């Protein structure tokens, strides 16, 4: 019966195991305040066919546990929202780099929200729960890993803040801690804070994770758990590696020193050398599995590449540790898009598109996530597309691709703190990747900054994104870090052989978004601190060059942009204009793309993406308001009025046959105070000459006064 | 093209062959009244790569043939409704147990609604059609089978009642019969009716199936079809089986005689013996297919397990036939849930949660599902969840698993007859299975009864579910049942090697739901009658245990429960409160989760899950109704209203130059009812004393009275 209390200042954490889902390999329950999340870990005992661990993590969100039914067509949990996916990816990046190398077995980690009390967000709890569940099962691991969330309010750092605090916080930082104060996963989003606060926040965050790790350590000792031995680890034998090293080290060395090689040329040289070595290895060791052969070659290839970096301080093209790839920019690419930007760094090419839209499209039907977390007060959202042809590949473009969604959210957080609070249109920014060579997401963010900057939206200041690469010479005995080198403007091949990915973006003043994908089993703070410092210098550089293309936003939005118009519609015409069940409005909306909303009984807001569409809508409404032929607005003209209804306070008379009758009151019927029109000898259907005094919008009745004629 | 008519009391059944889709192996058309259903059957001649029944049954609902249309964007029949899935599962469980053993060939049975009128029903027709279609094709089969539906109205049984009568009828039972009056499929729902009536309904139902099965025999004899010979049946050779029996019976008998093994320990010991035996088989028989070896071991395993049951009347755990596993219950797990229940039976553990919701979430836009089944009268629906980790298994978390849907419907039918007629909230009951060891569905139903019972919804009485298992000593020549034993509270291992599953749930007095998944090719009615009788005793026993944990619903709902309020929004601010297209209301709904409905022009219904959330909504709406400079002024006050315009029907005035120009009618201007404002010396911009008589909403005009001052 696991039972451990952990104290984090004003917050208490309850960790319990057993009594729930005892059939699974590892089951844990994490309770904070009144919200509790239970996590299960299942690992197969059969070597799955693959060259990698098939780790799959899901974070299902129970809407019913929050007191709401999902707004799906089936009133039930169907599909997964982005928020779940982002949370899952956070968990995946948080725990993956702790498994022993070569462990290739199916492993599913599932998170369930037992109950959400609406006072404590559960995402941070889930990460800790997985760590508890894993460390409490037989599955081999090197954890446990502690996770906290740090927010800043009024210059005060608060761990695990409540919903109200997030909305009021300028910084949302998630820190994942490993033993001996090692950071394993970093993720943050800030309203453009300075660097110094970021330094202090991290130092606090790891400090708290140390406490949480002690409790889990205490819990494991109390319960007692034996780690099952896997059937067979898939690491290559040293002999195959060493033979591989003696067979390709010089050729690979030559390949990686060719500063003129592009992405493609380098791979082909790498690939062809791979073939020759693979044949020779098969000759020497036919008994060896192909998986081992392929793995061995990669290890040797990875090893030498890193060695070159550690020694000669030249990555692949003579570039130093701080130099950047060539950067190109282009704006106003087409004459139609409201905002266009062509951003190309080195070989990576990214296209960003800015498109305005009506405020009606910004409805967030997903209530539970917006209730628990909140809504982006700025009507802003981003699309990130990674077509397969961007990497000379084959596949299907899916909007639910986890890698695609994760990158997009990172860009969205990057650009968020610069959108002005108030704007008469939703800003839907679409970024498309055309040629990918690493660090696409930051490049996507930069281009979006450019396209928006051209679109005329008065943003605060330009936003720059840059990735950071690292290589460490590891000491095999203790696993500590011997030496390390930091890379700026990382290349794709650098990432693959690299140890960790550091995506940080912000503005000239401070930092907005940060995401660190690490693969080592932990890194000390000092390395991270230098990385931020190094990234800042390049950030200033990349902003400096980008500013030459454009410096200030356009004084006005580009022509052919969206237009907003308001139209007066008389109530009599309203039924005609709307049509039965509003079908006419839908048809007009479907046909010309013009979005029309009813401001009130007489006025209708009309949105048109183009003035041409505005003209089409203006014509259509003019036609609809023309069949309801309301005569000219005259104050002294006398028109025949058809007495439709004989009331007691007056006569409902239709001055024109194209609209309903109005209260020709007894005070508007005769100069004497009549109180029944029957005293005037008025019959139904009789035409009475009533002077037209225009229309009175106060009561919706056109001003008719028969008293001036009688 | 064979044709035949079958008389069922007041209803006629027409079955025709040929004339339609002659290309398929088996094509049949079933016509009742004016509803006709076509059933097709296809069976590939090549042995399937699978190692079991690759049977797939689908039943599509063409809304066009029912005078309706689907409510999807594409207007097509995109996706499958639950009702379709339940119908398909009914058919599958109705024909599967008649295929010859080992027939491993792809087979798909499709159902189409040629035309659906407003009287008869397609489901019962579909089952009969499949039986006709199979028996008319060259697919090996031991059919045909007959399916009828029995309803009870005014204590009178009616076969195949019209959909107009389902709502009136207190019972809805489906019976599928085999030759020699053998039941195959049993599916029933009822309103807590007595056991005796259930007995009579079954006796009648099988009796009618004897007629319908008789007719099909007439048709097939008339047409004279010949069943094709399969390439090869996949039953293991008797010789191999005998060797296994002589090699594994001793150890297997030892394993199952243990009374200490859990599920996990028992299976692995079985699995361990399986590995040893399988290896030795390969030694003896290298020619045999590996799958045959696997199948042979299972067969002798099954035979021994059933054998030991028959001879010693002791189940695999050390219980008796009537005894049941120990049961534990717990309520009120977390203070942030309107109702929680933890139900544990044996090793099966199930969690049930009760979540109230606003009535608006209960909309079910589906034309056909009401075009046939009928109307809804209890705003309540259950969600059943069977996550993979509940069985130490890795899978895909997805709510479209057929097994999940089938179990969920069974629970929903189980609890239906106890929900009150009316309730100010929808009742979404979510049950999650945490540890599965068989009979989870009834356990889920029981827990839902508990959680509901805790939630404070006043129900009729507690609901108990139990499963029944049967083992038969079969005569290999006749196929009749020489001997049989019944098992209460069946274990998963018992089920897998058992003969049939009997899920029946009811109250302390009667029976609500009954699903009988059977795998034998038919069982006599006397068998079922005993099973229900035995199940009745257990149901009382479970209720005896459950009553200790709770016996009556709470006096009221939980404090944090949902709240109801009505707000009087002034008409003047109504547009501002609503906004263009109700955008504010949509925004308000997404922010706090509080839903708003327009009771009328002045009253708005507000539904909140928590009083705290309501408090937030109340502040927001109060702010919206107060932030305006134009507020509800004090009644009866006199204001010096400036005249903005002089007209005929009255005078447009504003109390202070922030409000709008309001029409003070001539009847409201003077006691003698002057008819021109200039009669009082009024001018443009002149300030006049008028007493503020409140705001009566009839045309948007704010009330004033200058008549008293004259």
Verbal overview:
This is part of a larger assembly, with 2 copies of chain A (710 residues). By secondary structure, chain A is of the alpha+beta class. Chain A is built from 16 helices and 27 strands. In chain A, the strands form 5 sheets. An 8-stranded antiparallel sheet of chain A has the order 8-7-9-10-19-18-16-17, with helices on both faces. In chain A, strands 1-2-3-4-6-5 form a 6-stranded mixed sheet. Chain A is elongated and about 120 Å long. Chains A, B: Its main location: cytoplasm. Chains A, B: GO terms for molecular function: 3'-5'-RNA exonuclease activity; identical protein binding; miRNA binding; poly(G) binding; poly(U) RNA binding; polyribonucleotide nucleotidyltransferase activity; RNA binding. Chains A, B: It is a peripheral membrane protein.
Q: How do the strands and helices of this protein lay out in sequence?
A:
This is part of a larger assembly, with 2 copies of chain A (710 residues).
Chain A: E1 2-8, E2 11-17, E3 26-32, E4 35-47, E5 55-59, H1 82-95, E6 105-115, H2 123-135, E7 146-153, E8 156-159, H3 163-168, E9 171-178, E10 182-193, H4 195-223, H5 238-256, H6 263-284, H7 290-312, E11 327-331, E12 339-345, E13 348-357, H8 367-372, E14 380-385, H9 402-415, E15 426-435, H10 440-455, E16 463-474, E17 481-488, H11 492-497, E18 500-507, E19 511-518, H12 525-549, E20 563-568, H13 571-578, H14 583-592, E21 595-598, E22 603-608, H15 611-627, E23 638-646, E24 650-654, E25 662-665, H16 666-669, E26 687-696, E27 701-705
Helix pairs in contact in A: 1-2, 1-9, 5-6, 5-7, 6-7, 9-10
């Amino acid at each position: 019966m696991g039972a451990v209390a952990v104290d984090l200042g004003n917050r208490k954490l309850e960790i319990s195991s057993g009594k729930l889902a005892r059939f699974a390999d590892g089951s844990a329950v994490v309770q904070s305040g009144d919200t509790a999340v239970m996590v299960t870990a299942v690992s197969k005992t059969k070597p799955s066919p693959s060259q990698f661990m098939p780790l799959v993590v899901d974070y299902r969100q129970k809407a019913a546990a929050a007191g709401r039914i999902p707004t799906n067509y089936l009133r039930r949990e169907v599909g997964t929202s982005d928020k779940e996916i982002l949370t899952s990816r956070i968990i995946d990046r948080s725990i993956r780099p702790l498994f022993p190398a070569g462990y290739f077995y199916d492993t599913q980690v599932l998170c369930n929200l037992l109950a959400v009390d609406g006072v404590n967000e559960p995402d941070v709890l889930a990460i800790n729960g997985a760590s508890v569940a894993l460390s409490l099962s037989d599955i081999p691991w090197n954890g446990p890993v502690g996770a906290v969330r740090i927010g800043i309010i009024d210059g005060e750092y608060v761990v695990n803040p409540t919903r109200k605090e997030m909305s009021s916080s300028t910084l949302n930082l998630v820190v994942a801690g490993a033993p001996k104060s090692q950071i394993v996963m970093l993720e943050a989003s800030a309203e453009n804070i300075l660097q110094q606060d970021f330094c202090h926040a991290i130092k606090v965050g790891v400090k708290y994770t140390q406490q949480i790790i002690q409790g889990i350590q205490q819990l494991v000792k109390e319960t007692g758990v034996t780690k099952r031995t896997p059937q067979k680890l898939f690491t290559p034998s040293p002999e195959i590696v060493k033979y591989t090293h003696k067979l390709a080290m010089e050729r690979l060395y030559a390949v990686f020193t060719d500063y003129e090689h592009d992405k493609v040329s380098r791979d082909e040289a790498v690939n062809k050398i791979r073939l020759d070595t693979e044949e020779q290895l098969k000759e020497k060791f036919p008994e060896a599995d192909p998986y081992e052969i392929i793995e061995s070659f990669n290890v040797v290839a990875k090893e030498v590449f890193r060695s070159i970096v550690l020694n000669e301080y030249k990555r692949c093209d003579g570039r130093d540790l701080t130099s950047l790839r060539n950067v190109s920019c282009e704006v106003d690419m087409f004459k139609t898009l409201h905002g266009s930007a062509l951003f190309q760094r080195g070989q990576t090419q990214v296209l960003c598109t800015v498109t305005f839209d009506s405020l009606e499209s910004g409805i967030k039907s997903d209530q539970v996530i917006t209730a628990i977390n909140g809504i982006k007060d700025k009507n802003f959202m981003l699309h990130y597309e990674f077509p397969p042809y961007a990497t000379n590949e084959i596949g299907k473009v899916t909007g639910l691709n986890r890698r695609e969604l994760g990158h997009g959210a990172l860009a969205e957080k990057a650009l968020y703190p610069v959108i002005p609070r108030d704007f008469p249109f939703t800003i839907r920014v679409t970024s498309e990747v055309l040629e990918s060579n690493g660090s696409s997401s930051m490049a996507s963010a930069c281009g979006g900054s450019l396209a928006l900057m051209d679109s005329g939206v008065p943003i605060s200041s330009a936003v720059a994104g840059v990735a950071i690469g690292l290589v460490t010479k590891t000491d095999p005995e203790k696993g500590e870090i011997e030496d390390y080198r930091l890379l700026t403007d990382i290349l794709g091949i650098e990432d693959y052989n690299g140890d960790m990915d550091f995506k940080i973006a912000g503005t000239n003043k401070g930092i907005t978004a940060l995401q660190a994908d690490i693969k080592l089993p932990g890194i000390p703070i000092k390395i991270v601190m230098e990385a931020i410092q190094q990234a800042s210098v390049a950030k200033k550089e990349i902003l400096q060059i980008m500013n030459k293309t454009i410096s200030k936003p356009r004084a006005s939005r580009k022509e052919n942009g969206p237009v907003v118009e308001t139209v007066q519609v008389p109530l009599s015409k309203r039924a005609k204009f709307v049509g039965p069940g509003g079908y006419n409005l839908k048809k007009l909306q479907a046909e010309t793309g013009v979005t029309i909303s009813q401001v009130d009984e007489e006025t209708f807001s009309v949105f048109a993406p183009t003035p041409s569409a505005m003209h089409e809508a203006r014509d259509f409404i003019t036609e609809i308001c023309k069949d309801d032929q309301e005569q000219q607005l005259e104050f002294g003209a006398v028109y025949t009025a058809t007495i439709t209804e004989i009331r007691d306070t007056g006569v409902m008379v239709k001055l024109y046959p194209n609209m309903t009758a109005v209260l020709l009151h007894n005070t508007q019927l005769d100069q004497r105070k009549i109180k029944h029109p029957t005293a005037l000898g008025l019959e139904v259907g009789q035409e009475i000459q009533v002077k037209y005094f225009g229309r009175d919008p106060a009561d919706g009745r056109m001003r008719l006064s028969r008293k001036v004629l009688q």
